[PDB]
Amino acid sequence: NKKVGVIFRLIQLVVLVYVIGWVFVYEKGYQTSSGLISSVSVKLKGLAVTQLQGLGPQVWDVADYVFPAHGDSSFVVMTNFIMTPQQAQGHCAENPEGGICQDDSGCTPGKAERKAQGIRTGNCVPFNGTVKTCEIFGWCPVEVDDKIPSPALLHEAENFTLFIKNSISFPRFKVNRRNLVEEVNGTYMKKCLYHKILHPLCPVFSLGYVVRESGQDFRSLAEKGGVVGITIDWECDLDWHVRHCKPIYQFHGLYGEKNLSPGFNFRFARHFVQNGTNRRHLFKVFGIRFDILVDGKAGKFDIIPTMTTIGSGIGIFGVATVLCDLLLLH
Amino acid sequence: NKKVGVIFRLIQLVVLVYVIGWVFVYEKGYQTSSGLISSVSVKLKGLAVTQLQGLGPQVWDVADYVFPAHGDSSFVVMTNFIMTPQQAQGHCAENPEGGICQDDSGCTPGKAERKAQGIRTGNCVPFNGTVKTCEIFGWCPVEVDDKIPSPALLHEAENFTLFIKNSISFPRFKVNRRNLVEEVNGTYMKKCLYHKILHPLCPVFSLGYVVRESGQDFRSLAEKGGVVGITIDWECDLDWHVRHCKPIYQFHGLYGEKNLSPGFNFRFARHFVQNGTNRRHLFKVFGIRFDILVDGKAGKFDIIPTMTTIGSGIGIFGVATVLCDLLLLH
Amino acid sequence: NKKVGVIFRLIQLVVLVYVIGWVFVYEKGYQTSSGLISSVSVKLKGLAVTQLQGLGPQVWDVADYVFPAHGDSSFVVMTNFIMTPQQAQGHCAENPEGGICQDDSGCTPGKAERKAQGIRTGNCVPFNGTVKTCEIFGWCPVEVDDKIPSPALLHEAENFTLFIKNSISFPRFKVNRRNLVEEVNGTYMKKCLYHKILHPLCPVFSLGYVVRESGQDFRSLAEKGGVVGITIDWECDLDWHVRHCKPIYQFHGLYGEKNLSPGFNFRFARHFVQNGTNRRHLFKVFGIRFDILVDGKAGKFDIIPTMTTIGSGIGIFGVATVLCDLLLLH
Numbered sequence: 001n002k003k004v005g006v007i008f009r010l011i012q013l014v015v016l017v018y019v020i021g022w023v024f025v026y027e028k029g030y031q032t033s034s035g036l037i038s039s040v041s042v043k044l045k046g047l048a049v050t051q052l053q054g055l056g057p058q059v060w061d062v063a064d065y066v067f068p069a070h071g072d073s074s075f076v077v078m079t080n081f082i083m084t085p086q087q088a089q090g091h092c093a094e095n096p097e098g099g100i101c102q103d104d105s106g107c108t109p110g111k112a113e114r115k116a117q118g119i120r121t122g123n124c125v126p127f128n129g130t131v132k133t134c135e136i137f138g139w140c141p142v143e144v145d146d147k148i149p150s151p152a153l154l155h156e157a158e159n160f161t162l163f164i165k166n167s168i169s170f171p172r173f174k175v176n177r178r179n180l181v182e183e184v185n186g187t188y189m190k191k192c193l194y195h196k197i198l199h200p201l202c203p204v205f206s207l208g209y210v211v212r213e214s215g216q217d218f219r220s221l222a223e224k225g226g227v228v229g230i231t232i233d234w235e236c237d238l239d240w241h242v243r244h245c246k247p248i249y250q251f252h253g254l255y256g257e258k259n260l261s262p263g264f265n266f267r268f269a270r271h272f273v274q275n276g277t278n279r280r281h282l283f284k285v286f287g288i289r290f291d292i293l294v295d296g297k298a299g300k301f302d303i304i305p306t307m308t309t310i311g312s313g314i315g316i317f318g319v320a321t322v323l324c325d326l327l328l329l330h
Numbered sequence: 331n332k333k334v335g336v337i338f339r340l341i342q343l344v345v346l347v348y349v350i351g352w353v354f355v356y357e358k359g360y361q362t363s364s365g366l367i368s369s370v371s372v373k374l375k376g377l378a379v380t381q382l383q384g385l386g387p388q389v390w391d392v393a394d395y396v397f398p399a400h401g402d403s404s405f406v407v408m409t410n411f412i413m414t415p416q417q418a419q420g421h422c423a424e425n426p427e428g429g430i431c432q433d434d435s436g437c438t439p440g441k442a443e444r445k446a447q448g449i450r451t452g453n454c455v456p457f458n459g460t461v462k463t464c465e466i467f468g469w470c471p472v473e474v475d476d477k478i479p480s481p482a483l484l485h486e487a488e489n490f491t492l493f494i495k496n497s498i499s500f501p502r503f504k505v506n507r508r509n510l511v512e513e514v515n516g517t518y519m520k521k522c523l524y525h526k527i528l529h530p531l532c533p534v535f536s537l538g539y540v541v542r543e544s545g546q547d548f549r550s551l552a553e554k555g556g557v558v559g560i561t562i563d564w565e566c567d568l569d570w571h572v573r574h575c576k577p578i579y580q581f582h583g584l585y586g587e588k589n590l591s592p593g594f595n596f597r598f599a600r601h602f603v604q605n606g607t608n609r610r611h612l613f614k615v616f617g618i619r620f621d622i623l624v625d626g627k628a629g630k631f632d633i634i635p636t637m638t639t640i641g642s643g644i645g646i647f648g649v650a651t652v653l654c655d656l657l658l659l660h
Numbered sequence: 661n662k663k664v665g666v667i668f669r670l671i672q673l674v675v676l677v678y679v680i681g682w683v684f685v686y687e688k689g690y691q692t693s694s695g696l697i698s699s700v701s702v703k704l705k706g707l708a709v710t711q712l713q714g715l716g717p718q719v720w721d722v723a724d725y726v727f728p729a730h731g732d733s734s735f736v737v738m739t740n741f742i743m744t745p746q747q748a749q750g751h752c753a754e755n756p757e758g759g760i761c762q763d764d765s766g767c768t769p770g771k772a773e774r775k776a777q778g779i780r781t782g783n784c785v786p787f788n789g790t791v792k793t794c795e796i797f798g799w800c801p802v803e804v805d806d807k808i809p810s811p812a813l814l815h816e817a818e819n820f821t822l823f824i825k826n827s828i829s830f831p832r833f834k835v836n837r838r839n840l841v842e843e844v845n846g847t848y849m850k851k852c853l854y855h856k857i858l859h860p861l862c863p864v865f866s867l868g869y870v871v872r873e874s875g876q877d878f879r880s881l882a883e884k885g886g887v888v889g890i891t892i893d894w895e896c897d898l899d900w901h902v903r904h905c906k907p908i909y910q911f912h913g914l915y916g917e918k919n920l921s922p923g924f925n926f927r928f929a930r931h932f933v934q935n936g937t938n939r940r941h942l943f944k945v946f947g948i949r950f951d952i953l954v955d956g957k958a959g960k961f962d963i964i965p966t967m968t969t970i971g972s973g974i975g976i977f978g979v980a981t982v983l984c985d986l987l988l989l990h
């Protein structure tokens with residue numbers, strides 16, 4: 001039948017176009033692909049002045065609010081803090097969250113099984129005028145974090161600046177690239193701010209802009225902590241010039257249920273010696289932590305992947321022809 | 331022959347069941363899978379009181395034994411420490427390991443090529459009553475770590491509490507999940523300990539339980555250091571409700587030969603100013619390094635993977651039928 | 661035709677050797693492969709003495725120039741530093757890089773939009789004899805990074821010693837390995853330096869040798885910072901003894917353009933209390949960031965991958981025979 005042969009030739013040309021256009025060209029079969037080794041450095045620029053009640057103003061700079069100082073892909077920026085200063089070791093009242101005692105007989109000498117705050121001496125001492133708590137041995141100024149400041153102390157960190165330097169290298173093709181592309185210059189970095197459409201290559205990011213692109217509000221996050229993830233994609237074709245290779249930045253907000261464990265917080269202490277006595281300042285910091293992940297793949301023309309793709313296409317063509325012949329046989 | 335056709339139809343139905351059940355249903359070929367972006371936060375709750383010989387009691391809290399105080403997937407929990415306090419710069423005797431001298435002529439001014447402890451002034455000064463060492467310029471109190479306390483100072487850290495908050499997000503399908511699930515509530519988080527069978531969803535882990543699940547005794551590791559790895563798997567099917575998505579926690583113990591460099595140890599110093607002089611307290615810490623790795627994928631139904639799997643199954647069926655016909659022809 | 665059958669048998673034997681030799685033996689298709697969980701610890705041993713102008717000699721040890729003192733795969737080794745000591749919070753002249761004022765009217769009370777150095781009080785005070793800058797409320801000793809020392813202060817770090825402890829475990833085959841192979845012993849670790857050909861198994865690395873293997877000169881990097889990446893490959897065959905499993909070390913230099921943001925640098929501060937006043941010492945550190953990445957494969961013989969490879973080879977053989985018959989028919 002003539003129409004049967006026409007349909008056969010149609011299937012032939014269809015599978016030919018499929019194997020020549022989709023596999024070979026669209027999927028870049030004619031090339032070999034390799035991954036990269038990446039290194040990320042972060043630098044924050046911004047200053048925050050916080051005026052605590054009954055205390056002098058405190059200035060926080062790059063060395064203050066960025067917790068990992070050397071610089072890492074995962075870093076925490078301080079947004080709010082509860083400060084307990086002049087902590088010294090002694091026998092003193094514990095926090096009421098641990099337990100409340102009405103008499104000394106209720107207290108038991110030892111340490112609490114869970115969430116221990118110290119070694120209970122065995123006496124019930126008044127924590128304040130109303131309630132009394134067990135006397136424990138430890139840092140006498142107890143961090144009381146029941147009250148969290150509604151306005152963020154380091155609210156200016158909403159619009160500070162962040163510079164991310166990402167250096168990637170493909171060793172298979174021996175090609176090293178950096179986020180500071182040829183289009184980016186010094187005068188550009190002097191005044192540019194990153195934008196999704198306007199300034200994609202600008203390496204200067206605003207923290208509030210990053211949080212908004214992630215899908216979260218900075219003010220709510222700065223109150224109790226947050227998690228933002230920055231993904232850097234280096235997908236490019238090495239057949240073209242190296243100037244075409246440009247990184248793509250994506251922002252995601254990692255959040256959970258608000259009623260259970262909201263935000264991100266940690267406790268750190270600074271130890272010093274004053275008047276011959278060892279003391280420490282404790283800080284419970286709620287901040288927005290940024291995790292940077294870089295993933296990229298470089299593909300360059302090679303003869304062996306091309307030959308393998310040609311062989312696979314010939315095999316698929318043969319299988320399709322055999323299946324079409326079996327269908328026409330009925 | 332009828333038996334030939336029976337065997338042919340048998341092979342046909344076998345390969346049909348294979349392509350319809352294994353590749354499609356079992357391997358979830360109709361679904362497409364995507365990776366996740368994950369962030370991990372750790373919080374330690376526990377307190378250790380250490381009484382050193384000829385020194386007042388020392389209290390260690392979350393700020394103390396957690397050196398990555400900011401919060402990272404890889405963190406070290408202090409289990410034992412050797413303390414050298416009141417280190418000041420000056421010309422003093424070095425450790426015997428660097429070298430033992432009997433006269434000043436044996437000493438050579440300069441710095442050691444390997445394991446340099448300081449700048450040798452060139453005079454042999456008595457390190458103690460028996461042996462004499464080269465005088466070097468540096469921290470005068472030299473840390474002597476020949477004696478390691480057999481009972482772990484922070485042995486209570488065996489049964490402290492650890493809270494791990496893991497937030498994962500699959501960008502393609504735009505689904506965000508957290509280690510805390512609907513089954514987990516606040517009252518549950520108040521009092522629960524993780525177990526492989528009893529409490530698989532409890533986010534509170536005991537350090538001793540974590541180490542024992544890794545096949546390691548807590549005492550021997552805490553004495554000289556250890557390495558524990560926690561892997562979090564988020565394998566789930568997005569065709570069902572998100573409530574079914576639950577993570578799986580697995581514990582591994584990374585250990586080496588005991589005679590050659592046993593355990594994990596590091597050294598850190600705290601600098602301060604006392605009486606107008608800059609001094610420091612040095613600590614050689616033997617602890618357990620916890621490395622947290624999160625790996626998971628999400629699979630959801632899609633039409634293009636379904637069509638590709640159907641095409642591949644039809645092709646495999648055709649190839650199998652052709653091979654069976656060729657075998658029957660022989 | 662006889663030659664037709666000869667060519668058919670030739671194609672048959674060729675595809676048979678291909679499926680049995682390349683797909684089965686060469687690619688190890690009969691072996692199933694699994695990944696590993698790895699942990700890396702770093703220890704630096706070196707001493708550097710720096711004599712600043714008008715200041716006493718400063719000694720830097722492992723606790724000093726290793727800012728990630730706890731021990732991480734990514735660590736920074738200090739090579740040069742600019743020190744601004746005795747910083748106190750007050751009203752003082754700002755750095756001239758922010759702005760230069762000729763009168764008090766030019767100053768505006770508030771904070772700078774970009775690169776803010778403090779809160780301007782609206783007064784123009786002389787920064788030095790020639791120029792005047794805006795008066796800001798912050799740390800009064802201003803870090804002036806215009807002059808960078810041409811010779812690296814911590815130049816000795818060129819030939820210090822780095823020890824890496826890498827513990828890997830393949831969970832599927834429950835096999836744990838460490839970089840301290842059977843060939844390496846304690847006496848060997850006492851005196852050895854890693855070499856690409858001479859001492860591949862020695863776990864002691866010289867920083868200068870590591871940087872030179874990455875194609876970078878240590879002097880120019882130590883002057884203003886650098887980035888080195890160490891990759892550890894654990895590819896091995898579990899069919900043989902575990903002694904044959906040995907790690908391979910590769911070094912990659914991650915560098916960028918020199919005119920635009922050269923090297924790696926960061927700022928850190930040490931806070932203390934002197935004479936009842938809280939002060940801090942600021943340090944701008946230019947160092948070499950070492951990023952350690954470990955990736956490995958373990959292959960062990962299994963029956964199911966063997967059967968799958970045999971089936972795939974039989975299918976490819978059948979397809980090749982069918983295609984050859986179709987070509988001969990033409």
Ligand SMILES: Nc1ncnc2c1ncn2[C@@H]1O[C@H](COP(=O)(O)OP(=O)(O)OP(=O)(O)O)[C@@H](O)[C@H]1O
Nearest residue numbers: 043044045161162163189204775805920921922925
């Ligand atoms: N977080 C940031 N926000 C805005 N600009 C930045 C930031 N980090 C760096 N820059 C700008 O990028 C340029 C190159 O950065 P580089 O790493 O060389 O810093 P630097 O000049 O050594 O340090 P500093 O900027 O403190 O003098 C600098 O001139 C600086 O002004």
Ligand SMILES: Nc1ncnc2c1ncn2[C@@H]1O[C@H](COP(=O)(O)OP(=O)(O)OP(=O)(O)O)[C@@H](O)[C@H]1O
Nearest residue numbers: 115145261262265373374375491492493519520534
């Ligand atoms: N390591 C831990 N061990 C036991 N319980 C913990 C731990 N970390 C947190 N929790 C409990 O989980 C609950 C929610 O955790 P969240 O991150 O909000 O702690 P928090 O309330 O900010 O810190 P804290 O309980 O110290 O004030 C808290 O009520 C706390 O009691």
Ligand SMILES: Nc1ncnc2c1ncn2[C@@H]1O[C@H](COP(=O)(O)OP(=O)(O)OP(=O)(O)O)[C@@H](O)[C@H]1O
Nearest residue numbers: 445475590591592595703704705821822823849864
């Ligand atoms: N960075 C390094 N350079 C040279 N040798 C090292 C280095 N780190 C460790 N070693 C040597 O390897 C041996 C085993 O390492 P181990 O982890 O036991 O060190 P350690 O004895 O705990 O610490 P230290 O040697 O500082 O007292 C030690 O005897 C030490 O001399």
Ligand SMILES: *[C@@H]1O[C@H](CO)[C@@H](O)[C@H](O)[C@H]1NC(C)=O
Nearest residue numbers: 096097127128129130131146
């Ligand atoms: C004392 O502390 C408890 C702690 O919960 C608090 O409820 C109470 O209001 C406090 N009383 C006063 C007078 O501050």
Ligand SMILES: *[C@@H]1O[C@H](CO)[C@@H](O)[C@H](O)[C@H]1NC(C)=O
Nearest residue numbers: 155156157158159160208773
């Ligand atoms: C937002 O950025 C602007 C810069 O024009 C700044 O004036 C403002 O204070 C920033 N907002 C906050 C809350 O800091």
Ligand SMILES: *[C@@H]1O[C@H](CO)[C@@H](O)[C@H](O)[C@H]1NC(C)=O
Nearest residue numbers: 182183184185186187188189
């Ligand atoms: C600086 O970079 C920008 C990139 O947007 C470019 O348009 C501009 O021409 C550059 N400046 C110079 C002087 O090349």
Ligand SMILES: *[C@@H]1O[C@H](CO)[C@@H](O)[C@H](O)[C@H]1NC(C)=O
Nearest residue numbers: 426427457458459460461476
């Ligand atoms: C002196 O120190 C050396 C160091 O090895 C030690 O062997 C010796 O016993 C010490 N002597 C005394 C009296 O402490």
Ligand SMILES: *[C@@H]1O[C@H](CO)[C@@H](O)[C@H](O)[C@H]1NC(C)=O
Nearest residue numbers: 113485486487488489490538
């Ligand atoms: C183990 O946990 C129990 C809690 O019941 C505690 O009493 C005990 O002290 C812990 N062991 C150590 C060595 O801390």
Ligand SMILES: *[C@@H]1O[C@H](CO)[C@@H](O)[C@H](O)[C@H]1NC(C)=O
Nearest residue numbers: 512513514515516517518519
């Ligand atoms: C708390 O969580 C546990 C999980 O085991 C569950 O059994 C219990 O019902 C929950 N409590 C409430 C009040 O929902």
Ligand SMILES: *[C@@H]1O[C@H](CO)[C@@H](O)[C@H](O)[C@H]1NC(C)=O
Nearest residue numbers: 756757787788789790791806
């Ligand atoms: C004052 O500081 C400026 C800052 O750029 C500098 O150019 C100038 O040479 C300095 N003058 C003196 C006398 O130090």
Ligand SMILES: *[C@@H]1O[C@H](CO)[C@@H](O)[C@H](O)[C@H]1NC(C)=O
Nearest residue numbers: 443815816817818819820868
């Ligand atoms: C290089 O190593 C040698 C060891 O023989 C040492 O003498 C020299 O000081 C080192 N170079 C530097 C710059 O430290």
Ligand SMILES: *[C@@H]1O[C@H](CO)[C@@H](O)[C@H](O)[C@H]1NC(C)=O
Nearest residue numbers: 842843844845846847848849
């Ligand atoms: C120490 O290790 C080296 C590895 O190069 C080996 O040649 C030597 O025999 C070992 N020493 C002993 C005593 O086994």
Ligand SMILES: [Ca+2]
Nearest residue numbers: 068398402728
């Ligand atoms: Ca860190």
Ligand SMILES: [Ca+2]
Nearest residue numbers: 068069398728
């Ligand atoms: Ca750190």
Ligand SMILES: [Ca+2]
Nearest residue numbers: 272273603933
């Ligand atoms: Ca002090």
Ligand SMILES: [Mg+2]
Nearest residue numbers: 097144145146
């Ligand atoms: Mg609380």
